[PDB]
Ligand binder design. Structure first.
Ligand SMILES: *[C@@](C)(CO)[C@](*)(O)[C@H](CC(C)C)NC(=O)[C@H](Cc1ccccc1)NC(=O)[C@H](CC(C)C)NC(=O)[C@H](CCc1ccccc1)NC(=O)CN1CCOCC1
Lengths: 235, 244, 195, 240, 250, 243, 212, 231
């Protein structure tokens, strides 16, 4: 065989590159940032109809001012979320304040490359981390198993990512309202999903300065789906 | 580094099997047959020694049947050295329980712990598994007389009658044929010997190639006795059933 | 903590334990239950150092409950008492020992007999027809030596117990705020509400 | 200490050791879980190539984790004991610190977390086991049924099956189970569970085990004759 | 740095063989012949002294070794592996028995400890099995005289008489014809010398042969007097002269 | 085969191919020399000027150990630095326990044993440097050369790198023509000449000279660098000889 | 310190003083001895300031982590036991704490737990903790009924701290009041003993031992 | 081929392929330039994005008031190495009340990278670094390679198409070395230098990244509208 922390002749780490392929097989997750807030949405993708879809938990709270969505080998994300929640609460204990979104993301990404022959392999899951703070305002971050993180105005990850990203390139502008961003996530999710989009197989969430991080109900999302269909038929 | 020479003893095959456990079972199938039969008033343990030499000391010998405590014994099939490592651990475990609770260890609890040790060697550590299968014969005041088996996988099951080692397929068919629930010990003694006599790879079954033991309540009033048979006692019981 | 008593009669074991919890010059509580059910037919009362008592009792409770689930079987009172003794015997040579004295009352369902064990913080175990920890014994033992018989009923045992509490309330220096009484028999564990 | 990374990614983005652990689950005996209006039922297959067995002492397929939660499985039997032991210890630890028994979701999350840890730790292989975990939360009457698998993912199910020929019995349950109206009674819930196993088993003699769990720590295992009556009734209605 | 070999070097093959143990037994087959015979009042163990060079002093190299005053050992196979096993065997007799019970262990239990050490080299990380088979003779009060063989796997068997190494097949057959249950110790020494002449090719005298017995107690070899219960070692190594005396009436 | 894939494995010849492969990395490096003299030792080294952008005199390659030992090396520069860091720890623990500064032969074996230790396991790589080193102690002057295998000897003169053969030939002539001995100041001059003559084997990029010395009379038994007037005087002597 | 909390018909009243001392030196008159753990949980502080302040703050962080992990507010029982298990680990090391964990949840209702540095943990309806606990008990016990109104209960809590503030040399400064209901805790102001004593003396006619 | 499985293995010609493969990761990275005069030392860096919706990856990192670096290659490795430098600079200040020499900073980075090339299990660092600083011996510029080699220079560049800027600085050597007491002119020369490595893309306001340190100037970084002056 071969070492776990080996470089390829092109100068890339084999295991990190292979973990990126696992993330491409994962279910779609989309995030959009506005001046009124940040929206996070995901495809649930139940493997069978007998599975109770509401138990599928791919959107997660880290703190009141920071939320998180995931895609790939979702079981690997549990220890990442556990670390994030501890990091956020620990900083509040040491400094009597909220922790910056960027500083939280950096703390999670420090775990990434702690593998070799530390854990036995990289994480096989990517994360969209959304939040707000007083200094840099509303923010969206894409955290990879390479240990790298980029800030984004909008970003998609998972199987329908390259198609959804191209659509986000055209649709995003700096004046988007929160409502406009909610509909836009639903629209793009409906496009890249296999099965027909409804309130049971897709889930929305958002983070605002005033109310903090909130996962939407199935009743609330269902109305936004109905509002979306009506507007597309209106021209 | 040393990665080059690692056999990876604790991995799955593409079919979802454990290579080393399967190969350890293949090893055990060439070992001398051992039979355990459970009657209403006792338990029999019978085992065949591996191709004997005439200059072997037979009376002061122990290969197949071992005593774990006063109420529990085991029959061995596989590598003897590996078995003794496990037997000493089981003996210690029994004494820990007695020290802690002031009661003799229940049979299943002893069996489970020994089987859990075997399981560990198949999931972590990178070491080869123990090439040993046990038949456990014992008594306690909860379930009475009990027969169990364990194998390198660390999986264990309970039985009325069972064989391990060589020719188990043929031996299990014969036991399934003649066994019934209201059976006595003396009948079970006869069944055990008759089954070995028909499944053996030797020309004829003799006293010097056997190990035998019973666990009866044949002591005086409500107590269990372990009898490990002497050579002359095996010679007599073989004549008494008309095999020689 | 202070007063814990135990009496074994024909068909049951009766435990009586004081209700007071006192710190400094203040009685902080007068309804404290100084006991834990270890299994359906086994009960343990306790007394000693603050904090240690409950921590130890609950630790034993958790271990016996774990055993019950694992084996789907109830350990005998003798077996439980031996486990508890060993834990205290380990403790006495630790960096910081458990300063807790206990009584274990149980009904053995296999033998159909009640059993009472007295164990101190050193790990000193004895089976007894009647037992006590602390200063209580200096009054109750002589009293029970006189009035106790081995063939007594549960009702007779409760009257015998009333006689002990009355004596303690007369001659003990501290106000221990009465006792909670519990009975252990073939049908399990129950509490006497009016004592 | 033995350090080797046994669970690793491949070029196509798969972890073969985790996927091969799923094959071990596929080899295991079938296990099914169905939840009704006021109960959950766990059914389990037992292979009949083993006669001369002693059923008194042989390890049962369904295990109590606490007085209100049960766990069944499919896959390597020895591996399952390790998960069951860890779960039982955590159950008692939760009661000790939180002064309340575990929820079914919490217990599942713990067992699933253990399985995940064995997929990215050095010197260990994944568990060759998938589990069905069922019960009722403390002071609650809503039935709970969860599933776990070697990778570590877990989820809730109205009804679910695992093990060999599980795709056949899942097919049966998908058309026979109505979300709008689940099995109203205990009898209806057991019958549907037995029916689903009869699609795969062979004979309805000493091959099927049934365990019923009701609210407030009310768990009981059915005997041979009790199960056989369900088998006799179903076959007579079939001939039509 | 550090021992990265934490995994087993002996594993099961598809056919069920343990390769390294088989290969270790092959090394024992190549080794020089050694034997052991049990009499009514004693035990004898013998082997050829294969010299590496005539300039080498074969007296300095001892193939027959004292383990306790009443237990001795000989081998066939790899010499260096044997030497370190003798060191470990001598030590374990003290640490796991004499320092606990105040007396030397019985033969069967000392053998059981040596067998354990050899079994661990079959399963532990980063080691090969021992390339030797041992013959261990000994006496103790409650079992009397006894002879044991120990193989690379860690298995051990009790024998009336046996041989191991180069010409063990022929030597075992020779011992079957001559062995009975009424043999005196001197008769067993005579048969030991006859059996060994068949496997030896070159010179056959007291200088090329190494032989030791487990017999009566030797007060003269004790080194002190005054304690009645201490009567001396039962292990004795026969001298070069003592062997030649028995080769004349052969 | 496959005997060359792992360190500490003997080939059927009895050779350790991984060490021989490390020697190839030394042969690829720049030239460095050592000259033993009347009452001390001199060290010199070739520094290739890759670009105009290199700061002259500010990429120092010769290293001091303690206050009386000098070390130069050819091959993988980082590996050499690791060896010197160990050397400095070895010398420090000697002086701590025994008071006196570490003797040169004592120091030589400390490095030797450490390098040799990296040929004993497959979990480490051999060193990719040959090290010329020495100094003055109670018994006088000593010059040593140490190789990837762990082998070292004493030397009258020593050389290693890409131009080792040219430097060896020139060193042999000095030993023959000066049987009674060579002075410290002369040995500095000669060291310059030999580096310049050895530069003919690396003449694409022009180079920078760097010398150091230890002498009982000239430097009072301590290790110093040659700079300024004495350095330029040695450069001019070398320039006159090539033409 | 003097701190108290009692259970009654309309929930829980919690009252504390605000003095800090180093021997006979009055170090502060304005110390906060109640800690707001969440909208439904309160913690009281007696003993060492650093010990109480540090660990009860640590407790709040552990409670926040519970509701993030379990998607549910922590019980008063579980919250109090985290603290009691923590201090038990330090038993003998010299921590000095007398605390009360007070709050409401659905499953428990209004609940009070006493927790101290030698590991004692007690559920109860009434507790007074601190150097002036006995002075508070004297007034509180003699006037307590379950059927007290919210208005009367608030006053009794206030009046009991005032009693201890007056007689205990190591208690004083001001009174801080809290009321805990099914909807959460409500703050009922800071009350300086400088003004409150005379106001109570005049209106109530009590404190006749003092020169008017 | 057969000798590139790990860092502990030499090739038949004496090469360490895993170290060479790490060197390759630097070549793929975005360009970054370094140069100095006698009074000041400057870093210029071209930042890279994922797409138009993403941010630009930050290339420059501060180590102390008087020292910092720019990166090219694996960014997480630069974070580990810079953190080590931050600790070493800090150890010098707390224990000796001494600002760490830039030359010693290099020696410490070399020795840390080397240990990862001689042991089994580990891997080389996959990043190159340009370290600038002002200490007691004036301004300094260092180039770090993960092979362990550290070099002090007047000017240099690393990353993709870094040969263009390296050639320019080789021509401009005599000019920019004498830019003393004039920060803006030394930056202008650095901006003109990095421009020789551009293809199809030009320097924009959220693309460029500059950093400076000197005699009466602490290590500071300029981004955004603060670099509009130099376009
Ligand atoms: C009532 C008021 C009396 O107990 C309350 O119980 C309050 C509790 C509230 C404020 C939480 N308790 C105190 O005010 C408490 C009493 C006390 C003192 C010392 C040990 C235990 C309990 N006071 C303190 O904790 C004071 C706080 C103020 C700010 C000074 N702190 C000290 O006395 C400190 C630290 C004590 C200490 C604890 C453990 C290890 C070491 C030290 N000590 C000093 O500041 C030293 N001293 C002050 C006088 O000037 C010389 C230096």
């Amino acid at each position: 065989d071969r070492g776990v922390s080996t470089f390829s002749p092109e100068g890339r780490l084999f295991q990190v590159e292979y973990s990126l392929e696992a993330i491409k097989l994962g279910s779609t997750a989309i995030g959009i940032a506005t001046k009124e807030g940040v929206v996070l949405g995901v495809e649930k993708r139940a493997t069978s109809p007998l599975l109770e879809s509401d138990s599928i938990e791919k959107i997660v709270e880290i703190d009141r001012h920071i939320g998180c969505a995931m895609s790939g080998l979702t079981a690997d994300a549990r220890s990442m979320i556990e670390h994030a929640r501890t990091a956020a609460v620990t900083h509040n204990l040491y400094y009597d304040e909220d922790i910056n979104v960027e500083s939280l993301t950096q703390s999670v990404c420090d775990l990434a490359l702690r593998f070799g022959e530390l854990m036995s392999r990289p994480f096989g899951v990517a994360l969209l981390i959304a939040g707000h703070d007083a200094d840099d305002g509303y923010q969206l971050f894409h955290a990879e198993p390479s240990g790298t993180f980029y800030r984004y105005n909008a970003k998609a990850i998972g199987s329908g990512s390259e198609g959804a990203q191209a659509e986000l390139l055209n649709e995003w502008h700096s004046s988007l309202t929160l409502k406009e961003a909610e509909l836009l996530v639903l629209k793009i999710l409906k496009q890249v999903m296999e099965e027909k989009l409804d309130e049971n197989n897709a889930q929305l969430s958002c983070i605002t300065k005033q109310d903090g991080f909130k996962i939407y109900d199935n009743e609330k999302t269902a109305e936004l789906i109905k509002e979306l269909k009506e507007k597309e038929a209106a021209e | 580094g040393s990665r080059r020479y690692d056999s990876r003893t604790t991995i799955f095959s593409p079919e979802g099997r454990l290579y080393q456990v399967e190969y350890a079972l293949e090893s055990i199938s060439h070992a001398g047959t051992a039979i355990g039969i459970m009657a209403s008033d006792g338990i029999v343990l019978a085992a065949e020694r591996k191709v004997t030499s005439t200059l072997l000391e037979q009376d002061t010998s122990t290969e197949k049947l071992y005593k774990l405590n006063d109420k529990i014994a085991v029959a061995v099939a596989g590598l003897t050295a590996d078995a003794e490592i496990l037997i000493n651990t089981a003996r210690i475990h029994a004494q820990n329980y007695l020290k802690t609770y002031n009661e003799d260890i229940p049979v299943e609890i002893l069996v489970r712990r020994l089987s859990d040790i075997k399981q560990g060697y198949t999931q972590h550590g990178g070491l080869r598994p123990f090439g040993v299968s046990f038949i456990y014969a014992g008594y306690d005041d909860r379930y009475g007389y009990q027969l169990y088996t364990s194998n390198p996988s660390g999986n264990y099951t309970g039985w009325k009658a069972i064989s391990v080692g060589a020719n188990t397929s043929a031996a299990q068919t014969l036991l399934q044929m003649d066994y019934k629930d209201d059976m006595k010990v003396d009948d079970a003694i006869e069944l055990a010997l008759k089954t070995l006599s028909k499944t053996t790879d030797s020309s004829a079954l003799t006293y010097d190639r056997l190990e035998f033991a019973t666990i009866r309540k044949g002591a005086n009033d409500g107590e269990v006795y372990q009898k490990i048979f002497k050579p002359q006692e095996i010679k007599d019981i073989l004549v008494k059933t008309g095999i020689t | 903590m202070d007063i814990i008593l135990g009496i074994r009669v024909q068909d049951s074991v009766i435990l009586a334990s004081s209700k007071a919890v006192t710190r400094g010059i203040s009685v902080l509580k007068d309804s404290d239950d100084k006991t834990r059910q270890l299994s359906p037919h086994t009960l343990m009362s306790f007394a000693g150092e603050a904090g240690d008592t409950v921590q130890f009792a609950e630790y034993i409770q958790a271990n016996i409950q774990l055993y019950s689930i694992r084996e789907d079987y109830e350990l005998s009172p003798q077996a439980v008492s031996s486990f508890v003794r060993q834990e205290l015997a380990k403790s006495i040579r630790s960096r910081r020992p458990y300063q807790v004295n206990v009584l274990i009352g149980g009904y053995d369902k296999k033998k159909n007999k009640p059993e009472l064990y007295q164990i101190d913080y050193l790990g000193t175990k004895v089976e007894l027809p009647y037992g006590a920890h602390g200063y209580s014994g200096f009054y109750t033992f002589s009293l029970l030596d006189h009035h106790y018989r081995p063939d007594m009923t549960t009702e007779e045992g409760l009257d015998l117990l009333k006689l002990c509490v009355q004596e303690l309330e007369k001659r003990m220096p501290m106000d221990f705020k009465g006792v909670i009484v519990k009975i252990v028999d073939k049908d399990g564990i129950r509490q006497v509400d009016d004592f | 200490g033995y350090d080797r990374a046994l669970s690793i990614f491949s070029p196509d983005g798969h972890i073969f050791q985790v996927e091969y652990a799923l094959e071990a689950v596929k080899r295991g005996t079938c296990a099914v879980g169905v939840k009704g209006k006021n109960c959950v039922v766990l059914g389990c297959e037992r292979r009949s190539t083993l006669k001369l067995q002693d059923t008194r002492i042989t390890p049962s397929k369904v295990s109590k984790i606490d007085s209100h939660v049960v766990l069944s499985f499919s896959g390597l039997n020895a591996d399952s004991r390790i998960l069951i032991e860890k779960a039982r210890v955590e159950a008692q630890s939760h009661r000790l610190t939180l002064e309340d028994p575990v929820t079914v979701e919490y217990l599942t999350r713990y067992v699933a977390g253990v399985q995940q840890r064995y997929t990215q730790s050095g010197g260990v292989r994944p568990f060759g086991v998938s589990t069905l975990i069922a019960g009722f939360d403390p002071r609650d009457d809503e039935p709970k049924l969860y599933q776990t698998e070697p990778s570590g993912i877990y989820s809730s199910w109205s009804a679910q099956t695992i093990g060999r020929n599980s795709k056949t019995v899942r097919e049966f349950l998908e058309k026979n189970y109505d979300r709008k109206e689940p099995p109203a009674t205990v009898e209806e819930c057991v019958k549907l569970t037995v029916r689903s196993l009869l699609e795969v088993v062979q004979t309805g003699a000493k091959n099927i085990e049934i365990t019923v769990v009701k609210p407030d720590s009310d768990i009981v295992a059915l005997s041979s004759e009790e199960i056989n009556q369900y088998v006799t009734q179903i076959e007579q209605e079939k001939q039509e | 740095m550090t021992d990265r070999y934490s995994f087993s070097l002996t594993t099961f093959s598809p056919s069920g063989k343990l390769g390294q143990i088989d290969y270790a037994l092959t090394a024992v087959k190549q080794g020089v012949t050694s034997l052991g015979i049990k009499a009514t009042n004693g035990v004898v163990i013998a082997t050829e002294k294969k010299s590496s060079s005539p300039l080498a002093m074969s007296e300095t190299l001892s193939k027959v070794s004292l383990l306790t005053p009443d237990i001795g050992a000989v081998y066939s196979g790899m010499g260096p592996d044997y030497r370190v096993l003798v060191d470990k065997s001598r030590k374990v007799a003290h640490t796991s028995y004499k320092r606990i019970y105040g007396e030397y262990p019985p033969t069967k239990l000392l053998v059981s400890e040596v067998a354990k050490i050899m079994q661990e080299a079959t399963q532990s990380g980063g080691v090969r099995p021992f390339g030797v088979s041992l013959l261990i003779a000994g006496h103790d009060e409650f079992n009397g005289f006894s002879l044991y063989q120990v193989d690379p796997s860690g298995s051990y068997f009790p024998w009336k008489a046996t041989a191991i190494g180069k010409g063990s097949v022929a030597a075992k057959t020779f011992l079957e014809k001559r062995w009975n249950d009424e043999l005196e110790l001197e008769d067993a020494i005579h048969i030991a010398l006859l059996t060994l002449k068949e496997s030896v090719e070159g010179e056959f005298n007291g200088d090329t042969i190494e032989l030791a017995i487990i017999g009566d107690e030797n007060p003269d070899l004790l080194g002190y007097t005054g304690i009645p219960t201490d009567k001396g070692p039962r292990f004795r190594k026969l001298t070069s002269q003592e062997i030649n005396d028995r080769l004349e009436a052969l | 085969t496959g005997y060359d894939l792992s360190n500490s494995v003997f080939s059927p010849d009895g050779r350790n191919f991984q060490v021989e492969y490390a020697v190839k990395a030394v042969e690829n490096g720049t030239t460095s020399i050592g000259i033993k003299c009347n009452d001390g030792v001199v060290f010199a080294v070739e520094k290739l000027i890759t670009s105009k952008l290199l700061v002259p005199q500010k990429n120092v390659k010769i290293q001091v150990v303690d206050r009386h030992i000098g070390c130069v090396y050819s091959g993988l520069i980082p590996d050499g630095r690791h060896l010197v860091n160990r050397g400095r720890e070895e010398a420090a623990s000697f002086k701590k326990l025994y008071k006196t500064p570490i003797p040169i032969p004592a120091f030589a074996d400390r490095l030797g044993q450490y390098v040799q230790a990296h040929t004993l396991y497959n979990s480490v790589r051999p060193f990719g440097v040959s090290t010329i080193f020495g100094g003055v102690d109670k018994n006088g002057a000593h010059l040593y050369m140490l190789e990837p295998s762990g082998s070292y000897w004493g030397y009258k003169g020593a050389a290693t790198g890409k131009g080792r053969q040219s430097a060896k030939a020139e060193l042999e002539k000095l030993v023959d023509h000066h049987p009674e001995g060579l002075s410290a100041r002369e040995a500095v001059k000669q060291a310059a000449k030999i580096i310049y003559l050895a530069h003919e084997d690396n003449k694409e990029k022009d180079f920078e000279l760097e010398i150091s010395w230890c002498s009982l009379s000239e430097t009072n038994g301590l290790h110093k660098f040659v700079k300024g007037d004495l350095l330029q005087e040695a450069i001019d002597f070398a320039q006159k000889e090539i033409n | 310190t003097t701190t108290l909390a009692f259970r009654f018909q309309g929930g829980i009243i919690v009252a504390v003083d605000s003095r800090a001392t180093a021997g006979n030196w009055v170090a502060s008159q304005t110390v906060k001895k109640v800690i707001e753990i969440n909208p439904f949980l309160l913690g009281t502080m007696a003993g060492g300031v650093a010990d109480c302040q540090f660990w009860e703050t640590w407790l709040g962080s552990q409670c926040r982590l519970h509701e993030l992990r379990e998607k549910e507010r922590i019980s008063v029982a579980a919250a109090s036991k985290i603290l009691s298990n923590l201090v038990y680990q330090y038993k003998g090391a010299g921590l000095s704490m007398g605390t009360m964990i007070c709050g409401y949840t659905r499953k428990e209702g209004p609940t009070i737990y006493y927790v101290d540095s030698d590991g004692t943990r007690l559920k109860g309806d009434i507790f007074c903790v601190g150097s002036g606990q006995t002075f508070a008990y004297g007034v509180l016990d003699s006037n307590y009924k379950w059927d007290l109104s919210v208005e009367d209960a608030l006053y009794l809590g206030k009046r009991s701290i005032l009693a201890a503030a007056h007689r205990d040399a190591y208690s004083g400064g001001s009174v801080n009041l809290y009321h805990v209901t099914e909807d959460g805790w409500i703050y009922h102001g800071n009350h300086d003993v400088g003004e409150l004593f005379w106001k109570v003396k005049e209106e109530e006619g009590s404190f006749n031992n003092v020169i008017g | 081929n057969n000798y590139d499985g790990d860092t502990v293995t030499f090739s038949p010609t004496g090469r360490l392929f895993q170290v060479e493969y790490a060197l390759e990761a630097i070549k793929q990275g975005s360009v970054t330039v370094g140069l100095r005069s006698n009074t000041h030392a400057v870093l210029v860096a071209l930042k890279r994005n994922a797409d138009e919706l993403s941010s630009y990856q930050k290339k420059i990192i501060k180590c102390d008031e008087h020292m910092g670096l720019s990166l090219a290659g694996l960014a997480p490795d630069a974070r580990v190495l810079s953190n080590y430098l931050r600790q070493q600079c800090n150890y010098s200040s707390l224990v000796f009340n001494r600002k760490l020499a830039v030359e010693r900073a290099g020696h410490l980075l070399c020795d840390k990278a080397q240990k990862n090339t001689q042991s089994y299990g580990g891997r080389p660092y996959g990043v190159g670094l340009l370290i600038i600083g002002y200490d007691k011996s004036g301004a300094h510029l260092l180039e770090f390679q993960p092979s362990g080699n550290v070099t002090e220079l007047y000017g240099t560049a690393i990353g993709a198409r870094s040969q263009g800027a390296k050639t320019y600085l080789e021509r401009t050597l005599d000019t920019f070395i004498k830019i003393d007491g004039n920060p803006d002119e030394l930056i202008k020369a650095g901006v003109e230098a990095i421009s020789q490595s551009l293809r199809d893309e030009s320097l924009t306001v959220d693309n460029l990244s500059i950093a400076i340190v000197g005699k009466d100037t602490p290590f500071t970084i300029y981004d955004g509208e603060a670099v509009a002056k130099y376009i």
